[PDB]
């Protein structure tokens, strides 16, 4: 039994025609205090996977170490560690999902909501969610916390079902993600303006963007 201390808010993501996009702000909240501002909550694993984590940051840092160790262990006695036997997004997810559900079953959970975004070896987009309860699900768009309530509706207007994915470009997808991040800054009381964004494309690979800012905001007051 735990209670989360230093926390991270929404992680948002979606599929597009050639890959997946994922984003998360750089804030480490301490209750109502917006304590830490240089926190990276997107962690790449290899050149084909990005794990976005919300919830308790001490547990996030533990998960970082686990993923880091997983890369090391996979390389051992593995001549094809950078080829056919490289870590897939599906392997990384299932590992985390196993851990999350085992920890909930021991009544000592990792207080997190996690989204694993990546591209498989055959070019297929991978996007799946797992949380402190061990609950897993997949969808064209996935989001945690406030993102689930405010981002998903916006991202679902772009990709509402499976057939919309081939029709969605990386430009359109990134635009929707960046817009969603702005909306979260307007409305989530534990969000920051600064955020990171990652694109995993089956052609251009992993593009990791740091120090992005929410811009072009409106602040008008009605009369009465």
């Amino acid at each position: 039994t735990q209670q989360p201390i230093v926390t991270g808010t929404s992680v948002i993501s979606m599929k597009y025609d050639n890959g997946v996009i994922i984003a998360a702000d750089n804030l480490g909240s301490y209750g109502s205090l917006l304590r830490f501002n240089g926190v990276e909550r997107l962690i790449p694993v290899g050149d084909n996977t990005v794990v976005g984590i919300s919830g308790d940051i001490s547990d996030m840092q533990h998960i970082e170490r686990l993923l880091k160790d997983l890369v090391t262990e996979n390389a051992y006695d593995n001549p094809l560690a950078d080829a056919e036997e490289a870590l897939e997004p599906s392997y990384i997810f299932e590992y985390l999902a196993t851990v999350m559900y085992q920890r909930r079953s021991k009544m000592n959970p990792l207080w997190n909501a996690i989204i694993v975004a990546g591209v498989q070896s055959n070019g297929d987009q991978f996007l799946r969610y797992v949380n402190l309860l061990g609950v897993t699900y997949s969808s064209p768009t996935l989001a945690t916390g406030f993102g689930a309530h405010m981002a998903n509706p916006l991202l679902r207007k772009v990709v509402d079902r499976e057939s919309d994915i081939p029709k969605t470009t990386v430009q359109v997808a990134e635009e929707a993600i960046v817009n969603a991040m702005r909306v979260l800054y307007y409305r989530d009381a534990r969000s920051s303006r600064n955020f990171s964004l990652a694109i995993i494309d089956k052609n251009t690979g992993l593009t990791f963007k740091k120090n992005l800012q929410v811009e072009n905001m409106k602040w008008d007051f009605a009369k009465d």
């Binding site: 039994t1 735990q2 559900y101 909930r104 079953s105 009544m107 959970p109 969610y129 402190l132 309860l133 061990g134 609950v135 897993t136 699900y137 997949s138 969808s139 689930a148 309530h149 998903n152 079902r161 499976e162």
Partner: protein, 222 residues
């Protein structure tokens, strides 16, 4: 305090015919008032012509299915590739569930297939392993909406022969796969209308001696 359980909503439904059995379930997955996925399947082919669904808390549901699938694998290894009969699968699942009697899998489990005489079979479980073979069972969030409809339309309950003064009951007969799928679709559209956790899509797995077939239908997404 940490609460290890959650409710992922959705509903499932199993019907057995003479030489077939269906196991249906909506594809919506939820927490509270949010939709997690519009298409997250929870009815699975487990091999040996057994289909299974464990509806309720998805994490427990997935764990159970995963363990039973594994049980089928080891049953082959240990007993010379022998086919696991539906009755044996049922009993095995009882022990899986009751094994966690004091920290239960929060799921209503239904399996479907064919018995050793080739006839359609549906078995249903409570969260701690009590099981029973039936012609008919709905499980999950909208079970209370669907089940009485099934009593009326599958088992012809409260239906008497016209003109017989309520003395002669409507006789029991097996339904064709076409008739059964009509009832499944109507059951799920009705459940979608009146239950908020039910909708998005319907996935039906049909089991005959030839194998396992799938059918998908859209449901209302509101």
């Amino acid at each position: 305090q940490f609460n290890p359980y959650g409710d992922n909503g959705g509903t499932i439904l199993g019907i057995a015919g003479e030489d077939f059995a269906v196991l249906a379930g909506d594809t919506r997955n939820i927490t509270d008032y949010s939709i997690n996925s519009r298409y997250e399947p929870k009815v699975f082919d487990c091999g040996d012509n057994i289909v299974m669904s464990a509806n309720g808390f998805a994490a427990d549901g997935d764990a159970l299915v995963k363990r039973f699938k594994n049980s089928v694998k080891w049953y082959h290894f240990d007993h010379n590739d022998k086919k696991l009969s539906i009755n044996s699968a049922a009993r095995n699942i009882q022990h899986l569930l009751y094994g966690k009697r004091f920290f239960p899998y929060y799921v209503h489990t239904i399996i479907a297939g064919l018995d050793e005489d080739g006839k359609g079979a549906v078995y249903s479980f409570d969260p701690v392993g009590s099981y029973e073979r039936e012609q008919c069972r709905a499980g999950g969030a909208a079970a209370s909406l669907i089940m009485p409809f099934l009593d009326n339309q599958v088992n012809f309950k409260n239906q008497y022969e016209p003109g017989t003064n309520g003395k002669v009951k409507k006789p029991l007969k097996y339904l064709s796969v076409e008739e059964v799928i009509k009832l499944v679709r109507d059951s799920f559209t009705s459940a979608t209308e009146r239950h908020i956790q039910v909708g998005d899509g319907l996935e039906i797995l049909i089991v005959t001696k030839d194998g396992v077939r799938k059918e998908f239908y859209e449901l209302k997404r509101d």
